Design an enzyme around this catalytic site. Structure first.
Site, PDB file in Angstrom:
ATOM      1  N   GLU B  69       0.799  -1.231   0.000  1.00  0.00           N
ATOM      2  CA  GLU B  69       0.000   0.000   0.000  1.00  0.00           C
ATOM      3  C   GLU B  69       0.835   1.286   0.000  1.00  0.00           C
ATOM      4  OE1 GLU B  69      -2.720  -1.217   3.274  1.00  0.00           O
ATOM      5  OE2 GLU B  69      -4.191  -1.559   1.678  1.00  0.00           O
ATOM      6  N   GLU B 145      -3.933 -10.630  -0.451  1.00  0.00           N
ATOM      7  CA  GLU B 145      -4.868 -10.630   0.667  1.00  0.00           C
ATOM      8  C   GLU B 145      -6.261 -10.971   0.149  1.00  0.00           C
ATOM      9  OE1 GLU B 145      -4.660  -6.983   2.968  1.00  0.00           O
ATOM     10  OE2 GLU B 145      -2.505  -6.781   2.615  1.00  0.00           O
TER      11      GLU B 145
END
Ligand code: 149
Ligand code: MG
Ligand code: MG
Ligand code: MG
Ligand code: MG
Ligand code: NA
Ligand code: NA
Ligand code: NA
Ligand code: NA
Ligand code: NA
Ligand code: NA
EC number: 3.2.1.23
Lengths: 1015, 211, 174
Positions: B69, B145
Site C-alpha cells: 500500500e 490478501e
C-alpha cells in the site's frame, strides 16, 4: 559540526538542505517576457569578482572567515577553476584515480577553496516570496554559509545545487561563504579521462519565486502515424498554499502567433485508492500540422506556463522551447519522426585552453558552427551533464544530444566495484535522476546515458528502469560491461572495429557487422566512441562510413573526440605554448593522452576533420557514362539551398565546368546529364570533380559553403610520343672516392664508400646538406606508440616492434656501386643492405640514369625480410640546401593525407606556402604527407613519379626526439621525404595495433621510380 | 521482514514465504506521493536491498515483495529491476497501483472477488476470473490478501477455493489474517481482558479494525 | 552535533557508520559446530535486563546519561516495546498516520527511550578481531554510544542494524 561529520567522506550524504531539481526557471512576472525569453529581473547573476583563499585542508580554514573577509584572500573572477589562477596544479590522469583508492575516504591533504561574496539584497526580495541561491557547477563538494550561519552542503560537480536563503538574508549587505573541497566521496564517481580540476566553475545566481509557485513542469509531444497531428501535454506542479481561485494556463506560440492555449484549476486525475495530486494539473493542447523538430530543420515553438488567479492576476510564469519530435526504437531501428537516423556524432568535453572547464557562449557557438559545417548532426555529453546553455543552443541550432550522467568509476578493480554495490545506489541515483529532472524538456536531448566506464552493476539496471518509467520518450543507453547489457536500448560499443573481432574475455568487442546478428540480438548499433582522433589519426574512417551506409541497423556513432584537452602555459619570454599531462608537475600523469581531438584547443582544425566532413556528407554520388546520380541522405529536408558545381581537368588544367541546381527530396535521387566534353589531344588523365555548394548563408554556415564533394577518373590518354632527341651526353669521371657526372652547369656526385648521391651542383651552388638515402622508418605517431596509460608499454605496439627489430638503428652496408656510360646517359647501379645484429632487414637495389636532358631517373627495388615487422615507409630522404616559399604539387590535397586517410583529398594542382606542409600536432610525429602525387615542385627542383611525400624544416629525427611542438627548431634548408610506399596511420583506437592489413607494407618486394630534374 | 528465526522455522517445518520490504505509505495523498519521488528512492532502496542481502539464502523464501500500500511509483520499478538483476531465482511481486503493474511478476490483488467486478477508477479490482483473461494478460494470479477474517467472517470462502481449483492460473492467495491484534488490559480486580483501538487513550484510532 | 543534525528528520540519512547487510553469521571457529548449527561462543546474546528511562523528546535527555546511569531509570527486560511496560500508550491507527503528515518532519514531542547496559567482554576479544553489536530490531530510529563515545545511527525498524565496537571497547565494564 561541519568538520566533525566529514560529509565529504560519506556517500550516504550527497547533500544537506538542498532543494529539489527542476527544469530551468526564471520566475518571470510578465507573460510576454516569458514568451520572448528576455532576461528576468527575478533571476540575478552573482558572477564576477569574488574573494578567494587557498588552503591545504578544511582543517586549515580559520573560523573568522565564516563571518569576516580574510585579508590574505585575493579578488578573483567567478566562475573559474582555481588551478587556472595558479593556486595549485591541474592533474591529468586517464584511468588511475588522482587519490588513493580507499572509498569513501579522501586524502587528509585536501586542497580547499574558500570563496566569499559581499553583496546587496533588495528590500522587495525579502518582503515576500522565496529567495534561493543556485550554483550551476562546483567541483567537487562544498559547504555553504550565509551571514556566518551554515546553510547546506552539495555534491556532483556537474549539476546545479540550490538552497533556500530566505531566512538567512538581510536587507542591505550580505556575505556568502563557500568552502569548496577538491576531493570528496563524489570523486569516486568522477574518474573521467580529463584534467582534474576544482572550484566554482559554473554560474552562481539568485532566484526569487513567490511562495505560491510553479515548482516543476514537464512537456511531452505525442503524434499520430503520419505526424500530421500532435498533442502537447504539460504537467504542472505547484508549491505553496492551494486555493480554489488558482489556475494554470499553458500557451503555445509559433513566433508571435498563439497556436494553442488551455486553462485549468489544480487537481490531477485519480491515480490510486487515496486519490490524485491536488497540487498538480495537466494541460493537453491539440496541434494540427505541427512543424517538426530535427537537426536538419530545428523548428521550435514556445510553451509558456502561467500560474494565475481566476480573475486574471499573474502570480508567475515559466517557459521553455518546444521541439515537436518523436524518438523511438522500432524493429531494431532508432527512429526520429518515423525515420531511421544516421548519427554523424562526436564526443565533446567542456574544455577551454585558458579557462579550463569553464564554458562560455562564444566557445559553445563556435563549436556548434564548426560541428555542423563539418557534417556532424549529433553530440555526446562526455561524460556529464553540460552547462545549461549547451542544450538551449543545440535546440536552436539543431544537434541530436546524448545527455550523460556524471558517473565514471574507471579506476576501480573491477570496474563495477561501486556500481554493483547497493551502498552506492543513492549517490548514483541522484546523478541520474537530477539530470533527467533538469534536462527532460529539451528537444535536442534524444537519448539518456547512465554514465561511462563504470562496468555493469545492479545499480545501472535499477536506474535504467527508473528512466524508462519516468521518461518513455527517450531511449536509454550505457556501454559498461560489454556494450550490450540489460541496461541499454542500443548496442553502444567503444572502438569496436568494422570487420575485426577483439574477443576480450567477458567484455568482447565484436566486429560491428557481426555484433548485430549474434543469436537473439535485435537492437540498433551506434558506437558511443569510435575513430580515436589522437594526433595523426582517423585512418580507416571511410570503412566505418561504408558499413554505416550498407547496414540498416548500423546507425553511426560518436567520434572520440572534438577538441584536444591541451592547456596554455607561458615560457620565459611570456610566449604561450600548448601543454599536456605532466607539464604542471602533476604526477602520476598520462602525458599526451588528453589530446584526442579533431580540432586543436583553440578550435583550429587538425587535418582529420576534413576526412570526417567528407565521409559524413549528406549527398552520395554515382557516375555512369555522362550521368551523375545524386542521392540525398536527408530524412526531412528538400535540397533548397544546394547547387552542384562540376569541373573536368586534365592533370590539373581546367577544360570544362558548369553548375546545376539541385532539386532532391529527402532520400530521393536526381540525374544530371553532363554536356558534350571536348576531346583533349594532349596526354594525361581527365578528372571530374563535383561539389555541392550552399549559395545562401544560414544560422550555421556562410554563403558558398561546400557541403559535399566527390571525384572520378574519366578518360586517360597515355603518352606515346618520344621526348625531344638530345645530342648532349653527360660526362662521367671515376675517382677512388667518387663517381662524378657533369652536364652543362650541373654536377652529380656519388660517394663510392657509401653508395649514395652525396652532392649535386647547379653552377656553384650545392643542392644537398645530407645525402639522398633510403628511409624505412617514421617519427612514431601516437597510434604507432599505442599507449593509453603512461605506465603501460605494449610490446605489440608498432613502435616497440620496430625498435626491437632494429629499424631505427639499422646500418646501410654497401653491396654494389658501379658506373656505366650509355649512348645518351650515365648509369649508376647501387645495392645496399640494412642489418641489425647480423639480421638483414631490407635490401635496396637502385639505378640512377642521368640523360642528356639533365633528368635523373631513379629506379628503386626493395626487399623486406618476411619475418621483420612491416616497415613504416619505403622511400628516400635528403636535406636540401634550399628554403623556398611555395610547395607546388600534382596529387592528392590540399591537406595532409595518408593511405588510410585520403578519401577527402582531391587530385589537382595544389600550391601552398611551405609552413602549410607541416601539421603542428602538439606531440610531434611524422606529419604532412601527401599521397598519390605525380609531380612535386620546390625551388629549382621537380620530382616526377607516383609517390607520397612530405617537406618541412624538421627532420624525422628531430620529430621523434621532441615531445612538444613549441620546442621544435627549424633546421637548415629543407627536409624532403619521398616515399614509394607509406604505412597506414590507423586509429580505430590509439592503444593497440590499429592499422588494417591492407595498409601494412607486407608485400616483401616493392618497386618505385622517380625522376629528379631542374625546373 | 520478520524476526530471523521465522525463516529458519519455515525452512525446517516447510512453509512457502513471501518476504516483504518494510515500506508502507498508505496515509499519503495520493498513495504514491513518496514512492514516485526520487528523493525517497535511497530510503526505499535500503528497505528492499538489505532484506534481500539478509534473507536470500533461505529456501522457504520463494517470492520477494516490494512492500504494501504505497501506490505505484517509479521507485517501485527501479527496485523491482534491482531485485531481478541481483536474484533471478525468485519472482518479485507488489500489489500497489492496481495489482498488475510493471513492478510485479504476479497479479496480486487484495480482496478482489471471485465473480463480482469492483470497477474503482484507476485501480479497479476485477473479478479474479476476469482479470486473468484481460487483453494481453498472461501472468499468474495469487491474492496478496483475501477473505477478510474480521470477527464473524469468511462467508463465501468456498467460492474462492472452487475458483482456485478450476482455473490453472488462479494459484491461491493469502488470507487476511492469522491473529487478532488484541492487547491485554486488566480491570479493577486484576482480571485480563482483550483490548483494541482506543482502549489506551489513543486517539485518533480505528477501534476493532486491528482484529 | 547529534541534536544539531536532526538525522531523524532527513530521508537522506538512514544510517551513520552502519556495517553492510549480510546473511545470518555466527563466526564459528570449529567446522563441526557450524555443520550442526550449535551455539557459537563468538555470538553472544545481550538479551535480558537493561536500564531504561522515558523522555518526551530527545531534547529532554540529559548529557549525563551518556556516561552515567540516570537515578530515575528502571530495570526492564529487553527485547521489549516500551508501551507494553506502560511508559506511553500504544496507538492503533489504520491508514491515517499517527503524526501530522509533513515529510520529512516529525512532532517536536517525540517519545524517546533511553536504554543502557553495562557489560564485560572476553579478554581475547579485546586483543584481536572485530567485535560488532547487532540490533535486530529498533523501532523506529536510534543513536548509539559506547563508553560515552558516539558510534552511529540507524533506521528501518525491521532489519538488523550493526556497528563495529572494536575501537570503543575497554577492559572491565563497558
Ligand atoms: O574509453 C575511452 O576512450 C577515450 C580515450 O581517450 C577516453 O578515455 C574516454 O573518456 C573513454 O570513454
Ligand atoms: Mg558525501
Ligand atoms: Mg575512462
Ligand atoms: Mg572519392
Ligand atoms: Mg533520517
Ligand atoms: Na545504417
Ligand atoms: Na584521452
Ligand atoms: Na536547390
Ligand atoms: Na615526437
Ligand atoms: Na488454480
Ligand atoms: Na486491519
Amino acid at each position: 559540526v561541519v568538520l566533525q561529520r566529514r560529509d565529504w567522506e560519506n556517500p550516504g550524504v550527497t547533500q544537506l538542505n538542498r532543494l529539489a531539481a527542476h527544469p530551468p526557471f526564471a520566475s518571470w512576472r510578465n507573460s510576454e517576457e516569458a514568451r520572448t525569453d528576455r532576461p528576468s529581473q527575478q533571476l540575478r547573476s552573482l558572477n564576477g569578482e569574488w574573494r578567494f583563499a587557498w588552503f591545504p585542508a578544511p582543517e586549515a580554514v580559520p573560523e573568522s572567515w565564516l563571518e569576516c573577509d580574510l585579508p590574505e584572500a585575493d579578488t578573483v573572477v567567478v566562475p573559474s577553476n582555481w588551478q587556472m589562477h595558479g593556486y595549485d596544479a591541474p592533474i591529468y590522469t586517464n584511468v588511475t584515480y588522482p587519490i588513493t583508492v580507499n572509498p569513501p575516504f579522501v586524502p587528509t591533504e585536501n586542497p580547499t577553496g574558500c570563496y566569499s561574496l559581499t553583496f546587496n539584497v533588495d528590500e522587495s526580495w525579502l518582503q515576500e516570496g522565496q529567495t534561493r541561491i543556485i550554483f550551476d557547477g562546483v567541483n567537487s563538494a562544498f559547504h555553504l554559509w550565509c551571514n556566518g550561519r551554515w546553510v547546506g552542503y552539495g555534491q556532483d560537480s556537474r549539476l546545479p545545487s540550490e538552497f533556500d536563503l530566505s531566512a538567512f538574508l538581510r536587507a542591505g549587505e550580505n556575505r556568502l561563504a563557500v568552502m569548496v573541497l577538491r576531493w570528496s566521496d563524489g570523486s569516486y564517481l568522477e574518474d573521467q579521462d580529463m584534467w582534474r580540476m576544482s572550484g566554482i566553475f559554473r554560474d552562481v545566481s539568485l532566484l526569487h519565486k513567490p511562495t505560491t509557485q510553479i515548482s516543476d513542469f514537464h512537456v511531452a509531444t505525442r503524434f499520430n502515424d503520419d505526424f500530421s497531428r500532435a498533442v502537447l501535454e504539460a504537467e504542472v506542479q505547484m508549491c505553496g498554499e492551494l486555493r480554489d481561485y488558482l489556475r494554470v494556463t499553458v500557451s503555445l506560440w509559433q513566433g508571435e502567433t498563439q497556436v494553442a492555449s488551455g486553462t485549468a484549476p489544480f487537481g490531477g486525475e485519480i491515480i490510486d485508492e487515496r486519490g490524485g495530486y491536488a497540487d498538480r494539473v495537466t494541460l493537453r493542447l491539440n496541434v494540427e500540422n505541427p512543424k517538426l523538430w530535427s537537426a536538419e530543420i530545428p523548428n521550435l515553438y514556445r510553451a509558456v506556463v502561467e500560474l494565475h488567479t481566476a480573475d486574471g492576476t499573474l502570480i508567475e510564469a515559466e517557459a521553455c522551447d518546444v521541439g515537436f519530435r518523436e524518438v523511438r526504437i522500432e524493429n531494431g531501428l532508432l527512429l526520429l519522426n518515423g525515420k531511421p537516423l544516421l548519427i554523424r556524432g562526436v564526443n565533446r568535453h567542456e574544455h577551454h585552453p585558458l579557462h579550463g572547464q569553464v564554458m562560455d557562449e562564444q566557445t559553445m557557438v563556435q563549436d556548434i558552427l564548426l560541428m555542423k559545417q563539418n557534417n556532424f548532426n549529433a553530440v555526446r555529453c562526455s561524460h556529464y551533464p553540460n552547462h545549461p546553455l549547451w542544450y538551449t543552443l543545440c535546440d536552436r541550432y539543431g544537434l541530436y544530444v546524448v545527455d550523460e550522467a556524471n558517473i565514471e568509476t574507471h579506476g576501480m578493480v573491477p570496474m563495477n566495484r561501486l556500481t554493483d554495490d547497493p551502498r552506492w545506489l543513492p549517490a548514483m541515483s541522484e546523478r541520474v535522476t537530477r539530470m533527467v529532472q533538469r534536462d527532460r524538456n529539451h528537444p535536442s536531448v534524444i537519448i539518456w546515458s547512465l554514465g561511462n566506464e563504470s562496468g555493469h552493476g545492479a545499480n545501472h539496471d535499477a536506474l535504467y528502469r527508473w528512466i524508462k518509467s519516468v521518461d518513455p520518450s527517450r531511449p536509454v543507453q550505457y556501454e559498461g560491461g560489454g556494450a550490450d547489457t540489460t541496461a541499454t536500448d542500443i548496442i553502444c560499443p567503444m572502438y569496436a572495429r568494422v570487420d575485426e573481432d577483439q574477443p576480450f574475455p567477458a567484455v568482447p568487442k565484436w566486429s560491428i557487422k557481426k555484433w548485430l546478428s549474434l543469436p537473439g540480438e535485435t537492437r540498433p548499433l551506434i558506437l558511443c566512441e569510435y575513430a580515436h582522433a589522437m594526433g595523426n589519426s582517423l585512418g580507416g574512417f571511410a570503412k566505418y562510413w561504408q558499413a554505416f551506409r550498407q547496414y540498416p541497423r548500423l546507425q553511426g556513432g560518436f567520434v572520440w573526440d572534438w577538441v584536444d584537452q591541451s592547456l596554455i602555459k607561458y615560457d620565459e619570454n611570456g610566449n604561450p605554448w600548448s601543454a599536456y599531462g605532466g607539464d604542471f608537475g602533476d604526477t602520476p600523469n598520462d602525458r599526451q593522452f588528453c589530446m584526442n581531438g579533431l580540432v586543436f584547443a583553440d578550435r583550429t582544425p587538425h587535418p582529420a576533420l576534413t576526412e570526417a566532413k567528407h565521409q559524413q556528407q549528406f549527398f552520395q554520388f554515382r557516375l555512369s557514362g555522362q550521368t551523375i546520380e545524386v542521392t540525398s541522405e536527408y530524412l526531412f529536408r528538400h535540397s533548397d539551398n544546394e547547387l552542384l558545381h562540376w569541373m573536368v581537368a586534365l592533370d590539373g588544367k581546367p577544360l570544362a565546368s558548369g553548375e546545376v541546381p539541385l532539386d532532391v527530396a529527402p532520400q530521393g535521387k536526381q540525374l544530371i546529364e553532363l554536356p558534350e566534353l571536348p576531346q583533349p589531344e594532349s596526354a594525361g588523365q581527365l578528372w571530374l570533380t563535383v561539389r555541392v555548394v550552399q549559395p545562401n548563408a544560414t544560422a550555421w554556415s556562410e554563403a558558398g559553403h561546400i557541403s559535399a564533394w566527390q571525384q572520378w577518373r574519366l578518360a586517360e590518354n597515355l603518352s606515346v610520343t618520344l621526348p625531344a632527341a638530345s645530342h648532349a651526353i653527360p660526362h662521367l669521371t671515376t675517382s677512388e672516392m667518387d663517381f662524378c657526372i657533369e652536364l652543362g652547369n650541373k654536377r652529380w656526385q656519388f660517394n663510392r664508400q657509401s653508395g649514395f648521391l652525396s652532392q649535386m651542383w647547379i653552377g656553384d651552388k650545392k643542392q644537398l646538406l645530407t645525402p639522398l638515402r633510403d628511409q624505412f622508418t617514421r617519427a612514431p605517431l601516437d597510434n604507432d606508440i599505442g599507449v593509453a596509460e603512461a605506465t603501460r608499454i605494449d610490446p605489440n605496439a608498432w613502435v616497440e616492434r620496430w625498435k626491437a627489430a632494429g629499424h631505427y638503428q639499422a646500418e646501410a652496408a654497401l653491396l654494389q656501386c658501379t658506373a656505366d656510360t650509355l649512348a645518351d646517359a650515365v648509369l649508376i647501379t647501387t645495392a645496399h643492405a640494412w642489418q641489425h645484429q647480423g639480421k638483414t632487414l631490407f635490401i635496396s637495389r637502385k639505378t640512377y640514369r642521368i640523360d642528356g636532358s639533365g633528368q635523373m631517373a631513379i629506379t628503386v627495388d626493395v626487399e623486406v625480410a618476411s619475418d621483420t615487422p612491416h616497415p613504416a615507409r619505403i622511400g628516400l630522404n635528403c636535406q636540401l640546401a634550399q628554403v623556398a616559399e611555395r610547395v607546388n604539387w600534382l596529387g592528392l590535397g590540399p591537406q595532409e593525407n595518408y593511405p588510410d586517410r585520403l578519401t577527402a583529398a582531391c587530385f589537382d594542382r595544389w600550391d601552398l606556402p611551405l609552413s602549410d606542409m607541416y601539421t603542428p600536432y602538439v606531440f610531434p610525429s611524422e606529419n604532412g604527407l601527401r599521397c598519390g602525387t605525380r609531380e612535386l615542385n620546390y625551388g629549382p627542383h621537380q620530382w616526377r613519379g607516383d609517390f607520397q611525400f612530405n617537406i618541412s624544416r624538421y627532420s624525422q629525427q628531430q620529430l621523434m626526439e621532441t615531445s612538444h611542438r613549441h620546442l621544435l627548431h627549424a633546421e637548415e634548408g629543407t627536409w624532403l621525404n619521398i616515399d614509394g610506399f607509406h604505412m597506414g596511420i590507423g586509429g580505430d583506437d590509439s592503444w593497440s595495433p590499429s592499422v588494417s592489413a591492407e595498409f601494412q607494407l607486407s608485400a616483401g618486394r616493392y618497386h618505385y621510380q622517380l625522376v629528379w630534374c631542374q625546373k
